[PDB]
């Protein structure tokens, strides 16, 4: 989850970079100490993106550093190549796992944890906050921070289930990623796809609980409209789909549940599409109307960042364990201490 | 040096545009033939000169002081408004080649456009540079800055003042 | 480092030119053209000459700003060569020999102030079509705006009142 | 790249001239044939007084 | 590695006598459209022109130009403008053509001149009608032959016809209650277009104060510029706008024609007629050139009923020196080579082989005559087809004349020595008079001067008029039997094209023009293309579209129903129509004109050339080689079918009605007399149920109370559609043309644009709204709270500061600026390479590199330099103050409307002209329940309709 989750700030944040235009220009974002003495405007929500972005990456990095170092540890101890021996020692820093080391582990790590609790839905918050302080009339929702909270956790279940289905297959960790393990996450998604669902309905409330015309005429355009389709796959994959999780053995049928997470993942990106794109094609002026199609180069660079995460993703299963080894361990004496008292 | 220090042309002779455009004015072949006709001509330093004003091609001088060109400097109202020379280019009149004093910057003309009463004058911007900024530079330049109607500084560090 | 606009594909006052043949953007006056609002039809504001003659009067009267104008544009362009005094004795004229006119001769004073004017704008002698000859001071047509010229008039006649 | 240290020139200047000229221009004085320097700023009061010729 | 580069910087050799360098000085010139020349003012930077302005001073220009007068910086910077004598399309010198030249005169001179021939345009330059005056004393049987494609025919036909004179008519519009409008664009660019739009459009600003508001009644085919700013608009076809004219002369009771009409027409008939007879004296009947020769005469007959003659309609002496029928000295031209009669053949202009129409075939006639001549100004189609193509002089760098729609015949002045050579008119008829080597600066002295004498010449070349000259006041009787004894042509055989000029490229004489083809065109807003016009029930019936164009019929009750249908309309636009006219097949895409006629077909003359340069290369198609020279405007045999194959025609809208929102106000003159805040407060009851809106804010702002605070009004009354204001702010704030593909993709670069919203009942003849859109310059911007490196915020004096070098380009100040006056540098639009275009940019303005933003800055070059310019005037004089003149700061497209729509000026200072204008009652900003406080505000359309087409 922490791998997956640098991964994807690795492929996002070339996108605040790559969407510019005079992308070399990106750390004037940043308030760095320049000659012409000028600042960022600190009010913006791309302003917020920045710190956002950093703060969140610097976190996550921290976090898998420190919940990878006594992993480095034991890989560090039963490397048998001498030289590797050293590169997974520093690594480890030669972590020595130790009482007295042990309770600033826990303790650190439990605080971290606490730190990064409220830091993921704040920057997620603010990647909501950059349409959620606009005045698009599909933008300006004052739903947005919790909807987009629950879409990215929903989403980011959904990608959880379509790469850890493999590793629990392929690697035969079985034992270690049980049944209920997928039942449970199923169930966790089911809980922010509800949410999501809401935000939808909340979405259909403003519009026609509103008397303006141009909530109405986002309600008409996004169902009746030239970009309408993503709407309707949008209510087809988020919502329709989402219901056979709710029972049990469509939980523990392992190919319904992939393909099912597929289909949350794709209507998790078409729910973007709906919020960003046909908000933008129909404004308050109708002659600043007009279509957006995509051309190869979108695509292109989709693809590519699939590229990049999945690349990412499979130097991180060669070179480094993608099961704690430690809190394993920890969990299997946490099992059977239960199985003690009973 | 040896032109205004000791020969001793004032710089609006050959810069004669300083004081209404935004441009002050490089100087032509004309304004050196007007000495140069009789002033030691067929001279080895004067063969570029001399070339010029008989084909028309320029004198192709080298800029010092550059700005990037969307900046849109104005001399006039700089000079019309008690700033003089030596503030901005220093003591050219000693310069035997020129060089740029300094680096022009947002902090420096910010600088100036939010702390005018440091560098104002009263009026003498074209005297040559013998002039030296007196020790009651915060009372002289703040009756002058009151008295040129020199404008606050949250209306001269608008962009559209300087970049366009 | 990135120098995106830093040198705009625009042309700038005196930006050189490969269009163009000489190597200059900024083009040389077209002949027979006036601005707008501008005229030549009243000819002894423009040139010294209304019958062909010298004429000794002004086309507008006397006021002491005129005269301090023509006082300033006489320090900048005619003091150098002629002296603050008018006696020619300057540093120009001790570096070279130009040997210029004192302003305070009878010959001057006895002189009018048209022809001044012509001396302001078209300098004075030319080389003789036999035994040939030189130019002398070159004229101030482009640098001095004839309303200035005949300022400039108006301080000479101040200067030999002021010796005389 | 330090700043220059422009060389310090000798010879007459031009000052020497201009402040002898300002000297006489001000401050009253005789000369060969000249009756009295009547001073500029007050030349020049005279002359707009007595006025040049128009037109 | 070092910040810059070196920048070598090139001073004189000898100085420019008169100019300060650094500070632009202005030229007055002359610019004809159709040879009648518009006084313009032309900025010269260093010694070039850069923008053209309007001359105050002159007709046909009061303060503003058109749009071909603003484009004329970009067809002079053309950088396939013609470089070269060209013999045969190999180069030659101007000694090489002058001996050929002499050897063909004395070829000729033995004769007295029966093979040499001539072809111009229309020539109002008396310096060159002077010359070809003598050219025909020297050869007697020598002929003129003058033409242009958009001609003044049937206004000269119908002089005759009614006079027995060649005679003019001006039209004072600014004494004018009902202004009728046959078929006539005088508010569309053409002959005195500025000077008549000028008045109509000061008769038509109505404040509190204001009493009287005029009328306007158009009866048009096409729907054109003239036929928004009506009050009662009739879409009739141009075949039948005789009828119209004749069934106007009966009811008005003289001597016409009784006629059969539809019941629309029939009642908007009679009510053009009690409109007029109730105002006799103060109204016009204005017929177009367009329509035949006995609509002008019956015009003029009508004119003399209602005691209009000599009080609002002045009859005047021809200022085209001679008149002619031109399209009759075209068949007589192509007759006379069809004979093998024609020897030498001298064209200025024109573009004869691709401007005539195409029955006359006159490419294949051009090749019978052995030794042609060009003065082309381009390489173009004809100077491929004739040998010894000369260069001609642009006008900017040309010395001549020009007479106006008056006869004010200004003095064309050269702001540069002529670019590629340049050979003007003037020199090439004095090479043909015989003396060799003679400029066109010693040839219009010697006209002028021992004409109006040289101290006149001087005021002459000052000011832009001529004070002396003008064209005489003359009232010829009119034959009231003669315009009887006509047939007054009957409408009506089948589908009817009408021929129109392009309101963006004429003749198309400015195909190769960037800025005009990039121009989206009125009431259309079609770019880079031509297309046919259909009404959508003329479409439905021709293509075999599967369409009602019947649920466009309704009342507000199900309006929005009706928007949607409009919007399924589209997407049939781009539909490629095979047409076969008499022996003539276009095959062009149409797209849907709701405004038009029905059964009526506007092709727009202009397009498909070949031989311009890599603007508009093969843009269009072309509407020329199906003309008919018998009848030019229009004729009623056509065979519009289907064909499939549907072409990408492109819009800057896209989108056609307002979709029920509070966008363009319209109000009538009545209940505007009685109450002038009655337009907000139907809206805001509809909206809110309140008179008076309420929009609380939770931003402070900033307060603006002893400043200079810059503001933008916009007449709603006053703007017609001339788009004169999008090429000025153009011209002066150095805005790209991207390509066809571009505003495909949507982004077109256009710092103020025009809406056209086709709003009104049954959708099939709707009311059409023009509305300019540049940026509000929002006081609480949302497209400064959004942009994160602060690159646009707002100043001192309350106006968007758009900062081009610290934009990284994030466009989310395009996405949350609620009008998306916004504009990105997709791609590198600007001309990085090409240097004649690299001369024609502003340099007070900087010219955008790729990935930074772009709107209009209040045209911010012009405000700051009036802010020195009032700052070194207040320290020079010693008062501390700097107070800036309200007419200190005209905007471009300020300067240029020729209505004068656009107000711009200070709002804090009540006794400007904005302060003024904004306080009415009928003052409003775009988008109000969104805080932003505009600066730029509108005024309300208050009509002024009559009691027979509403009541
Ligand atoms: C500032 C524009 C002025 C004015 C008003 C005058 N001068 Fe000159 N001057 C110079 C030289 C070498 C002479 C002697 C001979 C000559 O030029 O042919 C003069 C003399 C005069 C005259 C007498 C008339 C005459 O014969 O020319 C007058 C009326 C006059 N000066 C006025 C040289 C120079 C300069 C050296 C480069 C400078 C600068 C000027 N003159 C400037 C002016
Ligand atoms: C008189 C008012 C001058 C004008 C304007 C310019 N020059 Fe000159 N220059 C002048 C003098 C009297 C002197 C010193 C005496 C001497 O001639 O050495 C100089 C010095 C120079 C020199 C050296 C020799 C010379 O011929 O003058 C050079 C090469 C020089 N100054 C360069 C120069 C240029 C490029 C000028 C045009 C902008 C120029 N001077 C103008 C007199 C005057
Ligand atoms: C102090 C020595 C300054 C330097 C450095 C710069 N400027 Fe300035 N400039 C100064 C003053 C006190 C004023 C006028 C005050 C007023 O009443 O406005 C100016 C004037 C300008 C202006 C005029 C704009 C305006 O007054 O609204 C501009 C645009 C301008 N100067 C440009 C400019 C640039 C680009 C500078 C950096 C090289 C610059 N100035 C420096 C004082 C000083
Ligand atoms: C004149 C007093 C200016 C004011 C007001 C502002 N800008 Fe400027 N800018 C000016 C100078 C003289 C410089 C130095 C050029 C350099 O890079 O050293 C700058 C610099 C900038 C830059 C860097 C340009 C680049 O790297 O492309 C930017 C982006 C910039 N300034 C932004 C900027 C903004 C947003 C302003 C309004 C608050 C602004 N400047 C005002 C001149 C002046
Ligand atoms: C203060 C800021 C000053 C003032 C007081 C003077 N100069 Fe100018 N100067 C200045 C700049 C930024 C530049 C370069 C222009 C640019 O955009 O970078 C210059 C340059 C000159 C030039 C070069 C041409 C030009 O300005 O475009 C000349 C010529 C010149 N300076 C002459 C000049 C003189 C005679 C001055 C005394 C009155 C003078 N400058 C003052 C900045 C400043
Ligand atoms: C011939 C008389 C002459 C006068 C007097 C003179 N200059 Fe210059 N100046 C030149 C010439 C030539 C140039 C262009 C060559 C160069 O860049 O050095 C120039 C350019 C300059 C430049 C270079 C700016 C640039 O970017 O190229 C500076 C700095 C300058 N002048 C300052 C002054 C000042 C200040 C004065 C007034 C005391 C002055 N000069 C007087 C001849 C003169
Ligand atoms: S914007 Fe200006 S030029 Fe364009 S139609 Fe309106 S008034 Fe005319
Ligand atoms: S839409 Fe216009 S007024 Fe609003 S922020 Fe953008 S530029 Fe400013
Ligand atoms: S949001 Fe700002 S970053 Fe640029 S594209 Fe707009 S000025
Ligand atoms: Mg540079």
């Given at each position: 989850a922490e791998a997956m989750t640098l991964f994807a700030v690795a492929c996002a944040g070339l996108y605040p970079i790559l969407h510019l235009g005079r992308p070399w220009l990106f750390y004037w974002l940043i308030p760095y100490p320049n000659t012409?003495?000028?600042?960022?405007?600190?009010?913006?929500?791309?302003?917020?993106?920045?710190?956002?972005?950093?703060?969140?990456?610097?976190?996550?990095?921290?976090?898998?550093?420190?919940?990878?170092?006594?992993?480095?540890?034991?890989?560090?101890?039963?490397?048998?190549?001498?030289?590797?021996?050293?590169?997974?020692?520093?690594?480890?820093?030669?972590?020595?796992?130790?009482?007295?080391?042990?309770?600033?582990?826990?303790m650190a790590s439990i605080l971290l944890a606490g730190?990064?609790?409220?830091?993921?839905?704040?920057?997620?918050?603010?990647?909501?906050?950059?349409?959620?302080?606009?005045?698009?009339?599909?933008?300006?929702?004052?739903?947005?921070?919790?909807?987009?909270?629950?879409?990215?956790?929903?989403?980011?279940?959904?990608?959880?289930?379509?790469?850890?289905?493999?590793?629990?297959?392929?690697?035969?960790?079985?034992?270690?990623?049980?049944?209920?393990?997928?039942?449970?996450?199923?169930?966790?998604?089911?809980?922010?796809?509800?949410?999501?669902?809401?935000?939808?309905?909340?979405?259909?409330?403003?519009?026609?609980?509103?008397?303006?015309?141009?909530?109405?005429?986002?309600?008409?355009?996004?169902?009746?409209?030239?970009?309408?389709?993503?709407?309707?796959?949008?209510?087809?994959?988020?919502?329709?789909?989402?219901?056979?999780?709710?029972?049990?053995?469509?939980?523990?049928?392992?190919?319904?549940?992939?393909?099912?997470?597929?289909?949350?993942?794709?209507?998790?990106?078409?729910?973007?599409?709906?919020?960003?794109?046909?908000?933008?094609?129909?404004?308050?002026?109708?002659?600043?109307?007009?279509?957006?199609?995509?051309?190869?180069?979108?695509?292109?660079?989709?693809?590519?960042?699939?590229?990049?995460?999945?690349?990412?993703?499979?130097?991180?299963?060669?070179?480094?364990?993608?099961?704690?080894?430690?809190?394993?361990?920890?969990?299997?004496?946490?099992?059977?201490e239960k199985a003690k008292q009973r | 040096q040896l032109h205004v220090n000791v020969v001793g042309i004032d710089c609006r002779y050959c810069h004669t545009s300083v004081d209404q455009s935004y441009f002050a004015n490089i100087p032509a072949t004309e304004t050196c033939m007007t000495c140069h006709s009789q002033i030691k001509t067929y001279s080895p330093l004067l063969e570029k000169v001399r070339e010029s004003y008989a084909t028309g091609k320029p004198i192709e001088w080298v800029k010092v002081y550059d700005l990037p060109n969307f900046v849109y400097f104005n001399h006039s109202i700089h000079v019309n408004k008690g700033i003089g020379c030596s503030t901005c280019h220093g003591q050219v009149n000693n310069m035997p080649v020129v060089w740029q004093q300094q680096a022009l910057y947002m902090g420096w003309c910010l600088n100036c456009h939010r702390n005018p009463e440091l560098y104002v004058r009263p009026r003498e911007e074209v005297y040559n540079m013998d002039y030296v900024p007196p020790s009651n530079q915060l009372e002289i330049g703040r009756q002058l800055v009151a008295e040129y109607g020199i404008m606050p500084p949250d209306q001269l560090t608008n962009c559209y003042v300087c970049h366009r | 480092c990135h120098q995106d606009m830093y040198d705009q594909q625009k042309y700038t006052t005196?930006?050189?030119?490969?269009?163009?043949?000489?190597?200059?953007?900024?083009?040389?006056?077209?002949?027979?053209?006036?601005?707008?609002?501008?005229?030549?039809?009243?000819?002894?504001?423009?040139?010294?000459?209304?019958?062909?003659?010298?004429?000794?009067?002004?086309?507008?009267?006397?006021?002491?700003?005129?005269?301090?104008?023509?006082?300033?544009?006489?320090?900048?362009?005619?003091?150098?060569?002629?002296?603050?005094?008018?006696?020619?004795?300057?540093?120009?004229?001790?570096?070279?020999?130009?040997?210029?006119?004192?302003?305070?001769?009878?010959?001057?004073?006895?002189?009018?102030?048209?022809?001044?004017?012509v001396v302001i704008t078209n300098g004075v002698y030319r080389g003789d079509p036999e035994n040939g000859g030189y130019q002398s001071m070159y004229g101030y047509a482009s640098r001095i705006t004839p309303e200035d010229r005949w300022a400039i008039a108006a301080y000479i006649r101040a200067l030999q009142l002021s010796q005389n | 790249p330090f700043t220059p240290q422009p060389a310090p020139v000798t010879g007459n200047t031009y000052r020497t001239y201009v402040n002898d000229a300002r000297t006489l221009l001000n401050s009253y004085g005789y000369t060969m044939e000249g009756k009295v320097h009547i001073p500029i700023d007050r030349a020049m009061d005279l002359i707009v007084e007595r006025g040049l010729p128009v037109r | 590695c070092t910040y810059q580069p070196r920048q070598y910087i090139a001073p004189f050799d000898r100085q420019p006598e008169g100019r300060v360098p650094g500070i632009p000085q202005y030229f007055a010139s002359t610019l004809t459209l159709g040879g009648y020349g518009t006084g313009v003012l032309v900025r010269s930077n260093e010694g070039r022109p850069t923008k053209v302005e309007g001359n105050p001073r002159h007709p046909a220009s009061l303060g503003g130009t058109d749009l071909f007068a603003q484009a004329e910086i970009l067809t002079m910077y053309d950088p396939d403008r013609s470089t070269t004598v060209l013999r045969q399309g190999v180069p030659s010198t101007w000694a090489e053509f002058t001996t050929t030249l002499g050897n063909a005169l004395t070829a000729a001179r033995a004769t007295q001149g029966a093979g040499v021939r001539l072809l111009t345009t229309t020539i109002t330059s008396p310096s060159?009608?002077?010359?070809?005056?003598?050219?025909?004393?020297?050869?007697?049987?020598?002929?003129?032959?003058?033409?242009?494609?958009?001609?003044?025919?049937?206004?000269?036909?119908?002089?005759?016809?009614?006079?027995?004179?060649?005679?003019?008519?001006?039209?004072?519009?600014?004494?004018?209650?009902?202004?009728?409008?046959?078929?006539?664009?005088?508010?569309?660019?053409?002959?005195?277009?500025?000077?008549?739009?000028?008045?109509?459009?000061?008769?038509?600003?109505?404040?509190?104060?204001?009493?009287?508001?005029?009328?306007?009644?158009?009866?048009?085919?096409?729907?054109?510029?003239?036929?928004?700013?009506?009050?009662?608009?009739?879409?009739?076809?141009?075949?039948?706008?005789?009828?119209?004219?004749?069934?106007?002369?009966?009811?008005?009771?003289?001597?016409?024609?009784?006629?059969?009409?539809?019941?629309?027409?029939?009642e908007f008939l009679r009510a053009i007629a009690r409109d007029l007879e109730e105002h006799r004296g103060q109204s016009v009947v204005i017929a177009g050139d367009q329509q035949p020769p006995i609509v002008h005469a019956l015009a003029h007959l009508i004119n003399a009923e209602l005691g209009n003659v000599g009080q609002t309609v002045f009859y005047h002496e021809p200022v085209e020196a001679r008149p002619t029928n031109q399209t009759e000295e075209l068949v007589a031209l192509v007759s006379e080579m069809a004979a093998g009669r024609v020897e030498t053949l001298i064209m200025i202009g024109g573009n004869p082989?691709?401007?005539?129409?195409?029955?006359?075939?006159?490419?294949?006639?051009?090749?019978?005559?052995?030794?042609?001549?060009?003065?082309?100004?381009?390489?173009?189609?004809?100077?491929?087809?004739?040998?010894?193509?000369?260069?001609?002089?642009?006008?900017?760098?040309?010395?001549?004349?020009?007479?106006?729609?008056?006869?004010?015949?200004?003095?064309?002045?050269?702001?540069?020595?002529?670019?590629?050579?340049?050979?003007?008119?003037?020199?090439?008829?004095?090479?043909?008079?015989?003396?060799?080597?003679?400029?066109?600066?010693?040839?219009?002295?010697?006209?002028?001067?021992?004409?109006?004498?040289?101290?006149?010449?001087?005021?002459?070349?000052?000011?832009?008029?001529?004070?002396?000259?003008?064209?005489?006041?003359?009232?010829?009787?009119?034959?009231?039997?003669?315009?009887?004894?006509?047939?007054?042509?009957?409408?009506?055989?089948?589908?009817?094209?009408?021929?129109?000029?392009?309101?963006?490229?004429?003749?198309?004489?400015?195909?190769?023009?960037?800025?005009?083809?990039?121009?989206?065109?009125?009431?259309?807003?079609?770019?880079?293309?031509?297309?046919?016009?259909?009404?959508?029930?003329?479409?439905?019936?021709?293509?075999?579209?599967?369409?009602?164009?019947?649920?466009?019929?309704?009342?507000?009750?199900?309006?929005?129903?009706?928007?949607?249908?409009?919007?399924?309309?589209?997407?049939?636009?781009?539909?490629?129509?095979?047409?076969?006219?008499?022996?003539?097949?276009?095959?062009?895409?149409?797209?849907?004109?709701?405004?038009?006629?029905?059964?009526?077909?506007?092709?727009?003359?202009?397009?498909?050339?070949?031989?311009?340069?890599?603007?508009?290369?093969?843009?269009?198609?072309?509407?020329?080689?199906?003309?008919?020279?018998?009848?030019?405007?229009?004729?009623?045999?056509?065979?519009?079918?289907?064909?499939?194959?549907?072409?990408?025609?492109?819009?800057?809208?896209?989108?056609?009605?307002?979709?029920?929102?509070?966008?363009?106000?319209?109000?009538?003159?009545?209940?505007?007399?009685?109450?002038?805040?009655?337009?907000?407060?139907?809206?805001?009851?509809?909206?809110?149920?309140?008179?008076?809106p309420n929009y609380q804010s939770l931003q402070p702002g900033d307060d603006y109370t002893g400043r200079n605070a810059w503001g933008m009004t916009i007449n709603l009354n006053a703007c017609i559609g001339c788009n004169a204001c999008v090429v000025a702010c153009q011209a002066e704030n150095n805005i790209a043309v991207v390509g066809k593909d571009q505003v495909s993709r949507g982004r077109e670069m256009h710092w103020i644009r025009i809406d056209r919203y086709f709003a009104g009942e049954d959708l099939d003849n709707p009311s059409i709204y023009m509305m300019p859109v540049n940026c509000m310059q929002c006081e609480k911007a949302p497209c400064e709270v959004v942009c994160p490196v602060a690159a646009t915020v707002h100043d001192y004096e309350g106006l968007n500061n758009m900062v081009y070098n610290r934009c990284v380009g994030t466009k989310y100040c395009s996405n949350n600026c609620p009008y998306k006056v916004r504009r990105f540098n997709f791609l590198q639009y600007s001309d990085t390479t090409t240097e004649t275009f690299k001369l024609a940019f502003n340099p007070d303005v900087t010219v955008r590199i790729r990935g930074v933003m772009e709107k209009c800055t209040y045209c911010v070059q012009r405000i700051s330099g009036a802010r020195i310019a009032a700052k070194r005037a207040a320290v020079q004089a010693g008062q501390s103050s700097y107070v800036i003149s309200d007419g200190a700061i005209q905007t471009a497209c300020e300067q240029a409307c020729p209505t004068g729509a656009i107000v711009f000026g200070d709002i804090n200072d009540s006794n400007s002209r904005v302060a003024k204008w904004k306080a009415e009652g009928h003052n409003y900003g775009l988008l109000g329940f969104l805080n932003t406080v505009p600066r730029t505000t509108y005024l309300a359309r208050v009509r002024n309709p009559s009691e027979e087409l509403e009541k």
């Open positions: 012409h003495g000028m600042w960022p405007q600190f009010r913006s929500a791309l302003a917020w993106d920045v710190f956002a972005i950093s703060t969140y990456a610097t976190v996550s990095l921290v976090f898998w550093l420190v919940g990878l170092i006594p992993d480095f540890a034991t890989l560090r101890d039963r490397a048998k190549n001498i030289w590797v021996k050293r590169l997974y020692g520093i690594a480890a820093l030669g972590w020595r796992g130790s009482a007295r080391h042990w309770h600033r582990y826990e730190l990064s609790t409220p830091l993921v839905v704040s920057v997620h918050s603010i990647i909501s906050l950059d349409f959620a302080i606009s005045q698009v009339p599909g933008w300006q929702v004052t739903v947005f921070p919790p909807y987009f909270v629950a879409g990215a956790v929903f989403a980011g279940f959904a990608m959880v289930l379509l790469l850890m289905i493999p590793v629990r297959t392929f690697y035969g960790f079985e034992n270690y990623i049980t049944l209920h393990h997928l039942d449970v996450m199923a169930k966790v998604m089911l809980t922010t796809g509800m949410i999501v669902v809401y935000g939808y309905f909340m979405e259909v409330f403003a519009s026609l609980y509103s008397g303006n015309e141009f909530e109405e005429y986002l309600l008409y355009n996004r169902l009746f409209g030239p970009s309408s389709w993503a709407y309707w796959g949008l209510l087809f994959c988020n919502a329709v789909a989402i219901q056979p999780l709710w029972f049990k053995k469509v939980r523990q049928n392992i190919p319904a549940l992939l393909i099912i997470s597929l289909i949350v993942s794709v209507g998790m990106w078409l729910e973007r599409y709906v919020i960003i794109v046909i908000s933008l094609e129909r404004d308050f002026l109708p002659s600043s109307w007009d279509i957006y199609i995509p051309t190869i180069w979108d695509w292109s660079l989709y693809i590519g960042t699939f590229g990049l995460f999945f690349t990412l993703l499979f130097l991180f299963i060669r070179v480094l364990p993608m099961i704690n080894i430690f809190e394993m361990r920890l969990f299997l004496y946490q099992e059977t | - | 005196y930006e050189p030119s490969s269009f163009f043949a000489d190597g200059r953007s900024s083009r040389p006056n077209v002949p027979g053209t006036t601005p707008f609002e501008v005229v030549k039809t009243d000819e002894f504001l423009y040139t010294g000459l209304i019958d062909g003659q010298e004429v000794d009067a002004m086309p507008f009267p006397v006021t002491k700003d005129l005269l301090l104008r023509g006082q300033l544009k006489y320090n900048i362009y005619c003091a150098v060569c002629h002296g603050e005094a008018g006696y020619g004795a300057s540093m120009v004229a001790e570096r070279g020999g130009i040997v210029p006119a004192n302003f305070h001769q009878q010959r001057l004073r006895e002189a009018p102030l048209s022809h001044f004017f | - | 060159l009608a002077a010359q070809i005056e003598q050219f025909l004393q020297a050869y007697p049987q020598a002929r003129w032959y003058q033409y242009e494609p958009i001609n003044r025919d049937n206004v000269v036909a119908g002089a005759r016809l009614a006079f027995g004179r060649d005679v003019t008519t001006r039209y004072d519009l600014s004494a004018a209650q009902v202004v009728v409008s046959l078929d006539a664009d005088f508010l569309a660019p053409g002959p005195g277009f500025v000077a008549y739009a000028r008045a109509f459009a000061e008769r038509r600003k109505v404040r509190k104060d204001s009493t009287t508001m005029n009328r306007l009644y158009v009866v048009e085919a096409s729907p054109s510029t003239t036929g928004t700013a009506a009050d009662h608009r009739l879409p009739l076809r141009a075949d039948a706008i005789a009828a119209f004219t004749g069934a106007l002369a009966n009811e008005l009771g003289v001597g016409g024609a009784p006629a059969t009409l539809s019941p629309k027409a029939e082989v691709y401007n005539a129409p195409g029955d006359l075939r006159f490419a294949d006639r051009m090749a019978s005559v052995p030794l042609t001549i060009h003065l082309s100004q381009f390489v173009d189609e004809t100077s491929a087809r004739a040998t010894w193509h000369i260069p001609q002089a642009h006008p900017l760098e040309s010395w001549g004349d020009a007479r106006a729609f008056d006869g004010t015949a200004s003095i064309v002045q050269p702001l540069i020595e002529p670019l590629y050579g340049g050979k003007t008119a003037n020199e090439l008829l004095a090479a043909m008079l015989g003396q060799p080597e003679a400029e066109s600066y010693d040839l219009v002295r010697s006209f002028w001067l021992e004409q109006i004498g040289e101290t006149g010449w001087q005021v002459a070349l000052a000011n832009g008029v001529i004070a002396e000259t003008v064209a005489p006041v003359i009232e010829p009787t009119l034959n009231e039997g003669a315009i009887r004894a006509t047939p007054i042509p009957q409408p009506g055989d089948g589908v009817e094209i009408v021929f129109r000029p392009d309101p963006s490229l004429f003749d198309g004489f400015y195909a190769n023009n960037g800025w005009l083809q990039e121009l989206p065109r009125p009431l259309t807003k079609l770019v880079w293309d031509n297309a046919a016009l259909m009404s959508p029930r003329t479409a439905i019936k021709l293509l075999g579209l599967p369409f009602n164009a019947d649920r466009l019929i309704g009342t507000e009750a199900d309006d929005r129903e009706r928007q949607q249908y409009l919007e399924q309309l589209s997407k049939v636009n781009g539909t490629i129509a095979r047409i076969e006219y008499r022996g003539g097949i276009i095959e062009i895409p149409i797209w849907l004109l709701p405004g038009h006629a029905e059964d009526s077909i506007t092709l727009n003359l202009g397009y498909g050339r070949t031989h311009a340069g890599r603007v508009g290369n093969n843009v269009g198609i072309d509407v020329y080689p199906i003309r008919t020279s018998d009848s030019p405007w229009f004729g009623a045999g056509a065979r519009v079918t289907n064909t499939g194959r549907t072409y990408l025609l492109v819009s800057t809208q896209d989108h056609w009605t307002l979709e029920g929102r509070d966008i363009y106000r319209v109000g009538e003159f009545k209940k505007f007399k009685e109450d002038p805040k009655y337009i907000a407060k139907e809206v805001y009851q509809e909206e809110y149920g309140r008179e008076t």
